[PDB]
Design a protein around this ligand. Structure first.
Ligand SMILES: *[C@@](O)(Cc1ccc(O)cc1)C(=O)O
Length: 316
């Protein structure tokens, strides 16, 4: 239009440019778009995106959603806000576990938000504020007996501290984020992979995941919140530079190429997800608000850096 403003090219979060980039990136990777829903998310959580690290995610699954996420600096009840805005059932059965988890340690945990371009509110992510004993997370009364039962299987693998938990609002499951004292080796990999029910992989799949883990490693476990079944596990490598990337699916290569990053220090994340329904690769990519800074503040370890958790080692 005859004096329509140019979308900025600088680093600072701009909401109108975000809307355009969500649309462009969904199109670029062949993902679905929900215009109205996307506008509702952007209106409800504008400040969260502005003040946190806003970033992208997808998986190598064909046609999978283009997701967009805020990692929070502004601490507030994002779940209540989601419900106010019409983005989440007020009767969702996972609300009780999310409130329990959020209320721990006198309310220290901080919620972040994970959305899909085609489907709206996807996940609520909880940073718990340090290395929490797995017990504290897996034995809140809101969790049924069959979920709390899994505690002992985790402790038996030396997966004894939890750093994050992410509730999936379509599937009444949670991804629980552990840090193990490593190095991660072949046998520890196999014992973790075995939880998923996935067919054992060839030796080079494992060798490659092991080459990209920090010494003290982060692994997410997908837990059905009714049955306690484990569907999936996922091993993460954070801030992998483009010239050091592992072998990736062409869909992930495309994603990393087309999704824009405006951060001073670019941040790509690669997850190797293994699961009974099929393996895949997850990718995340920085957009605005300094993803790397948030992750370092959480005491995450970056590819190529020392990767030793001293506090953890004093506890084990
Ligand atoms: C894990 O790698 C989990 C993880 C994965 C992606 C992002 O962005 C943050 C955290 C960890 O280091 O705790």
């Amino acid at each position: 239009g005859s004096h329509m403003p140019a979308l900025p090219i600088d680093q600072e979060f701009d909401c109108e440019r975000f809307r355009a980039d969500i649309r462009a990136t969904a199109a670029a990777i062949g993902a679905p778009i929900a215009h109205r829903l996307t506008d509702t998310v952007l209106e409800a959580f504008r400040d969260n995106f502005a003040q946190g690290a806003t970033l992208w995610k997808t998986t190598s699954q064909p046609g999978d959603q283009l997701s967009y996420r805020f990692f929070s600096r502004l601490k507030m009840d994002t779940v209540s806000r989601a419900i106010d805005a019409g983005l989440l059932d007020a009767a969702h059965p996972t609300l009780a576990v999310v409130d329990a988890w959020s209320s721990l340690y006198g309310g220290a945990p901080v919620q972040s938000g994970d959305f899909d371009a085609g489907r709206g509110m996807a996940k609520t992510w909880l940073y718990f504020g340090g290395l929490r004993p797995a017990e504290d997370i897996l034995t809140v009364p809101a969790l049924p007996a069959s979920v709390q039962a899994r505690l002992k299987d985790f402790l038996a693998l030396g997966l004894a501290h939890v750093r994050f938990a992410a509730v999936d609002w379509r599937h009444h499951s949670a991804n629980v984020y552990f840090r193990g004292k490593g190095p991660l080796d072949t046998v520890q990999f196999a014992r973790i992979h075995a939880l998923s029910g996935s067919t054992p992989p060839a030796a080079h799949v494992v060798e490659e995941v092991l080459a990209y883990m920090p010494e003290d490693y982060c692994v997410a476990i997908t837990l059905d919140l009714h049955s306690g079944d484990i569907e999936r596990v996922c091993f993460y490598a954070l801030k992998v530079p483009k010239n050091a990337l592992p072998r990736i699916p062409t869909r992930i290569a495309r994603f990393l190429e087309v999704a824009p990053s405006h951060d001073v220090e670019e941040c790509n994340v690669i997850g190797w997800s293994f699961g009974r329904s099929g393996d895949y690769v997850k990718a995340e990519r920085s957009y605005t608000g300094n993803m790397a800074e948030i992750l370092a503040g959480w005491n995450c370890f970056f590819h190529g850096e020392e990767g030793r958790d001293h506090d953890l080692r004093a506890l084990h």
